[PDB]
Design a protein around this motif. Structure first.
Motif: not given
Lengths: 118, 111, 111, 118
Positions: A17-18, A32-33, A40-44, A63-64
């Protein structure tokens, strides 16, 4: 010393998580990876509470997920642990998508996640 | 129908206002229990008419944070947001972390 | 291996003792944080070697009640009870019901 | 007046819960009847807290589902509601069986259940 959300974090599962800079209103975004090789990466995005400028603030984010119709929310506190390391103690709710209001009852999972700096 | 945008209330009479949801599913709003901002996202993967969503209420009158997650449904024809939440209290020592999180439900209907 | 019967501890040093599990999956025990009884059941449907279980700790030093549910696993070869719990506080007025329930995890290892 | 767990209770879904007499140690057993026509009964047992003989005690019980490898625990308070009716405000955790310790993270669901006398 203060615990700061900005930075890269990891948990026991190796998820990554970045979190970006926290602006004046306590808002932040990040990514969030997670794995499922196959990662996979998802935005937060969320907020850090700023009420009494605590050194260990509470915060929350959503986290979407990009690879699912589900949504997970996390809330927790940014602590300076007894051993001196910054740690994010969080609990989450994972909401699954259901088609019938009748199945709403079993659509929410709960758990924890502890992050330390990568 | 079942768009998050608008004004919502609950059995306790709280007032949640949500603005427009942008192309990425992001939205902001306010929660009046006295007014605190909220920010969240609605999932848009399969452009569902009743997607899941989550948001964070950044309380302005306490050091706590509450997160909500749920889905909108049509019961009649009445819209309803069925959500579950975690309320995180601020504790001074990590030793008290284990009792810092409350959980519950909140059902909202259009105001 | 991974039988609930025995003595367990956790990161906080609490002490949970569970007795024999009867043919119906029922069991009793004590929880020392100072000692309170607990009663629960382990699911026996498919006679699993690592069945789910749940129990209630009837605290003797407060008006609260905590319930635990989880499953035993073998990590090495070390047994571990991974549980999640709900701690219910006693409130005087139903209006305060919404903030009466805390949630968390507890991982136990053989003492 | 006191709220008493003993008796038959129902919720919004029409599930049916019967709780026996509570003994001196606060212990009780009962049955939980739910639909899936098609109805099934599973046993339950738990305790009512007796610490200061409160008129609205907290309690908890475990339902040992007969038609699944899962287990659900409920905890709550027996209230005399503002309208004078006895009501059980409960929250539950539903634990699913997983085979790999790695999948433990998503094996717990959470929700509520409000019961009133049948």
């Amino acid at each position: 010393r203060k615990c700061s959300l900005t930075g890269k974090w990891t948990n026991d599962l190796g998820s990554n998580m970045t979190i970006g800079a926290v602006n004046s209103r306590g808002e932040f975004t990040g990514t969030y990876t997670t794995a499922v090789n196959e990662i996979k990466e998802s935005p937060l995005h969320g907020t850090e509470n700023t009420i009494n400028k605590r050194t260990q603030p509470t915060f929350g984010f959503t986290v979407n997920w990009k690879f699912s119709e589900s949504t997970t929310v996390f809330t927790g506190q940014c602590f300076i642990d007894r051993n001196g390391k910054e740690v994010l103690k969080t609990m989450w709710l994972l909401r699954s998508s259901v088609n019938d209001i009748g199945d709403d009852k079993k659509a929410t999972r709960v758990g924890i996640n502890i992050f330390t700096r990568l």
